[model samples]
Target chain A: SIAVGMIETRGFPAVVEAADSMVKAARVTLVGYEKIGSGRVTVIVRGDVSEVQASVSAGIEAANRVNGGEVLSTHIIARPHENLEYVLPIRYTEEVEQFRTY
Target chain B: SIAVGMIETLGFPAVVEAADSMVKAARVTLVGYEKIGSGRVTVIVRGDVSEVQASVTAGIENIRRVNGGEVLSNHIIARPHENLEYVLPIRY
Candidate 1:
């Protein structure tokens, strides 16, 4: 089952770096990103369970290295409920489907 | 000019409580809620600068009464940039 991973940061640049590092660290596809108010942003990725785990860890590590970066939260939902994809922006879009591993 | 207020909480119930308390405390409108993974959720409100300040304070105070509730961040933007509403979800 594919897993969803997310890294929430306190700044836009940190979330961008996290997304970039996540895809490079594992066979994960960058699905989407979300920006909440108060400088909160999050990047979402999807891949195999183990791959998602690795990507999330790498994303946190890389985001923390950015100057003035602060990671607020991180989560990995293995085999997330299908309903979540309909309401949330974590699902893969056609533009990123080409990078899907499964 | 309307002001934007936000309260970020660690749980869904807490955020719900925050939103409810905010609107009841002042003439603020509950605009939206955001979830940024790891159980972090934030409630956005808009109203007059003084009203927003009052509501945000009430939100924080009420959310603390919820079991297991935790506030991560709180902020008030008195007259936020117009461009921010185009990109962010802080608009009324």
Candidate 2:
């Protein structure tokens, strides 16, 4: 099946600074995210369902701790561009071609 | 003096394929360019007094030899980003 992909955007007007900590936690933990100015954060992660859920749990928990606000909202959806294939190939095509060229 | 700036836009009616060859030569010559759309070419380059002129000459020659269009029209303007100071500056 497909390793899931996510594009998460978070914003809290009343507790903007706290979202900063949540975003940092996501990045330090290798959960992809970017600060798109004005306290908006987007995170992308790919992994098993359980692992992704746990990671998001930690993220939301971190934000709620500082903001004294509920997660506000959480949306989980399917990605239209996830490339899911069985038995992933562990070779870089560029490297293989370069080596063969002598 | 100052290095020049040129934003050259070239087009032709009966010589699109030849313009392709001119663009390739411009690229080989390290004159920065990008293909914007259907068949338009833009080149930007900067260098010394005569160096840039010669490079542009070669580019135009390459283009003219292929197609049956004039150099079209080239505008030579001073660059806003060309940092040129004669006596130099020493920072402590």
Candidate 3:
């Protein structure tokens, strides 16, 4: 994950540009959204070591284009998921199907 | 930065195989609510990732397809109006 740090300058408009440029670059996949408190655009670049690095660099540049600031920091992470195999009960029937009331 | 991880081995029925199927399979999404309650399915895989790992693993997974249990899109993401930048703008 790379954080497009220091983009507080151009405000909302600049941030929007930075976001659009990121998707256009296609260097990394946008994490759907950005967190405002940090003012950093978080993205998960798809690739091996080199690809990740390049994408992060691209993202940083993309943000820099919108506003001038440091890229701050970037890091790689590993994620594992819980599979359906572990859940319980098994199969729902229409006869007893549940409806959302709230 | 990723938290929430739950897994269910099918005694019930399904593990909406693809995120695309999350809503269709009767699974859930972070819709209509903004609380810390546990109905929304926060899939680290609520994630609309670019693609699959052929064999993949999200930081969190809740693939249960059956009985009595509830289906919540753990993506129960939200923010007080001040923190809305995560997604919803509550815009006009």
TM-score of chain B of each: 0.96, 0.44, 0.20
Q: For model 1, how big is the iRMS in angstroms?
A: 9.8
lDDT of model number 3: 0.30
Candidate numbers, best DockQ first, in rank order: 1, 3, 2
Q: Each model's DockQ?
A: 0.04, 0.01, 0.03
Highest lDDT scorer = 1
Model 2: share of true interface contacts reproduced: 0.00
Q: Residue-wise lDDT of candidate 3 within A49-77, one digit each (tens)?
A: 44344544455665555322234455543
**Of models 1 and 3, which has the larger lDDT?**
1
Fraction of the true interface contacts (Cα pairs closer than 8 Å across chains) found in each model: 0.04, 0.00, 0.03
lDDT of 1 by residue, B9-90 (tens): 7788999999999999999989898766567677889889999999999998998799999877776767653324433466
Better of 1 and 2 by TM-score: 1
Which pairs of residues clash in candidate 2, taking residues 3 or more apart in a chain or in different chains?
Answer: none
lDDT by residue for model 1 (A6-92), tens: 999985546656776787788888888787766678888888989999989998997878545689999999999988988999877
Q: Highest TM-score among the candidates is held by which one?
A: 1
* TM-scores of all candidate predictions against the true structure: 0.53, 0.27, 0.28
What is the lDDT, from 0 to 100, of the residue A12 in candidate 1? 53
